[PDB]
């Protein structure tokens, strides 16, 4: 029914408005709705700046069970030192509004990338995907994942080498996970932009050493970005290969042979999927789908890159293939409902790795969905 599709498109602004009102009401009416454990970490990290206790910092106020640390790169603390100058509520409401606006802007950038501009459809997409498990997880925790997605797609949209390079470098300096997006630029043969993005990431490392130095150092040696310190590896929310393999195993294999084989097979699948795509949005979406699978820690709130992927599926060049519609609706039903969020209740505690067949096998849900999408893209491209 394309008529109903047009009717709902016309009802965009007054559906995104409803979604934003509902989200804002929930956050500031329910206890722990505006808890913002990761925004409070970003605010209390730099708040201790200049006192030699920034990475030894722990934040158990909001989750006594698990003390939230400041695992971000020191450049993130440099960037968040201004947040120390803003009252907590004036920053919480600002951050929620910023994440919402970043979601709308990234949807608009995805539409532009696909070759069409549609403010109403962008509002509808923002409202519908606002409640996808990754987006609601980011909003709940205050984690900056929509903002970095916006920065990365802004870099992709801008053909100018310096703009894209600087955006990618700064965004990757704030968090190391989005650095995998740079690989897309390697695939796009944008060698100069990739070089500049790497240079900016190194200059962000230098800034972090300068400002947050003498307290946060050796961030790559003796630490290796160890997944354990960031958080539990086996918890179902950790939807990377490592999380699901640990669930089905009962013990974190980590760099084990069996995890390495999975890493290699997903590497080949993602490379074939990218080889099966030709448009910027699809290429970046495949690259980030692979990044979410290879990173040692990829919580649900990291999987906000799926939203541009669904936009590509339902509007990109493959808005006709039977498989394209099938997998777009599959991703929508999976994320909107959220299997990992539902399964997280079954496990005794976030630190329990042993699982029976149901709670372990169902823990491979998002991994299996991503691998199925990658294999489908590879086979359809090869054919």
């Amino acid at each position, epitope marked *: 029914g*394309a*008529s109903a599709w*047009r009717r709902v498109r016309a009802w965009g602004p007054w559906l995104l408005g409803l979604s934003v009102a509902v989200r804002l009401a929930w956050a500031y009416l329910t206890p722990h709705g505006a808890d913002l454990v990761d925004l409070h970490v970003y605010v209390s990290g730099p708040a201790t700046l200049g006192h030699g206790n920034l990475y030894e910092f722990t934040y158990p106020d909001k989750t006594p069970d698990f003390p939230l640390p400041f695992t971000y790169p020191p450049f993130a603390a440099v960037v968040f030192w201004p947040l120390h100058l803003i009252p907590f509520t004036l920053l919480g409401l600002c951050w929620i509004l910023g994440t919402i606006a970043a979601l709308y802007a990234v949807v608009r*950038l995805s539409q*532009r*990338l*696909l*070759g*069409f*501009d*549609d*403010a109403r*459809a962008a509002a509808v997409w923002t409202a519908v995907t606002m409640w996808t498990e990754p987006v609601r997880s980011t909003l709940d925790y205050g984690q900056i994942n929509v903002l970095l997605m916006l920065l990365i797609l*802004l870099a992709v*949209a*801008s*053909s*100018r080498w310096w*703009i894209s390079g600087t955006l990618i470098g700064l965004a990757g300096g704030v968090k190391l996970t989005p650095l995998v997006s740079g690989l897309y630029f390697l695939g796009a043969r944008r060698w100069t932009t990739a070089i500049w993005a790497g240079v900016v990431f190194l200059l962000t490392v230098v800034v972090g050493i300068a400002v947050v130095g003498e307290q946060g150092r050796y961030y790559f040696t003796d630490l290796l970005g160890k997944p354990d310190r960031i958080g539990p590896i086996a918890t179902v929310f950790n939807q990377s290969w490592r999380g699901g393999i640990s669930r089905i195993l009962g013990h974190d294999a980590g760099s084990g042979v069996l995890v390495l084989f999975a890493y290699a097979v997903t590497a080949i699948l993602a490379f074939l999927a990218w080889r099966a795509v030709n448009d910027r949005l699809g290429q970046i979406c495949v690259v980030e789908m692979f990044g979410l699978l290879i990173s040692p820690i990829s919580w649900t709130h990291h999987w906000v890159w799926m939203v541009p992927f669904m936009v590509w599926l339902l*509007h990109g060049p493959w*808005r006709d293939k039977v498989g394209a519609k099938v997998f777009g609706c599959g991703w929508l039903v999976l994320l909107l409902i959220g299997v990992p969020w539902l399964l997280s209740f079954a496990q005794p505690d976030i630190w329990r790795i042993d699982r029976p067949w149901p709670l372990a096998w169902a823990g491979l849900v998002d991994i299996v969905a991503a691998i199925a999408t990658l294999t489908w893209m590879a086979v359809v491209g090869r054919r």
Partner: antibody
Amino acid sequence: EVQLVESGGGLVQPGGSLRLSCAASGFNFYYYSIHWVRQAPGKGLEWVASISSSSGSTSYADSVKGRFTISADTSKNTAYLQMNSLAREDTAVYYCARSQAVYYWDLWWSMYHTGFIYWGQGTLV
Amino acid sequence: IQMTQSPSSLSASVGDRVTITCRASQSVSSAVAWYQQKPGKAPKLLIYSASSLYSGVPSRFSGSRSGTDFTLTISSLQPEDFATYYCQQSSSSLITFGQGTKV
């Protein structure tokens, strides 16, 4: 498969109105920008209108500004361009073509169409 | 935006490479396309973004950015490839097709 059909192209008195209609088949208007290009006898092509059909932004030339108002119809896949006080020198062959509009963010948005991939037949306005 | 192209009928010989200029003022990046229009028909797009040819267009066709200037080059007129060729700049504000140029 993909076809473009133009049912307009009537004859009008100097001053008046005329409604060109460019039916489309095999693709979705919303995903492409429909353009109207005219070509007077003895002269070359001249761009007339560049509706986007998704954002609804209407772009038409300066000498075209005061005499044209290009519409759109995504439901029926038609362009539906309109004139008023025309026929001073507007006798031409108004083709209609679609194009893919690709955007870049050079600190501010700058649309540019990739090119008129598919063209309809000729009209006789 | 004032716009002009090469003189019409600047290459009439058959069996040789043909060149043509797409003089454009201001700066339109790579938003230039070239079209083939046989008389009594509708133009057929040849190259999009002035660098890559369209699908189905013979591989002999090739357009290249000569700075702010644009050119269209093919192999020859072996398969009776004679028609009036046009080039435009697509800045999304005011599209101009320039002067008509016959093969």
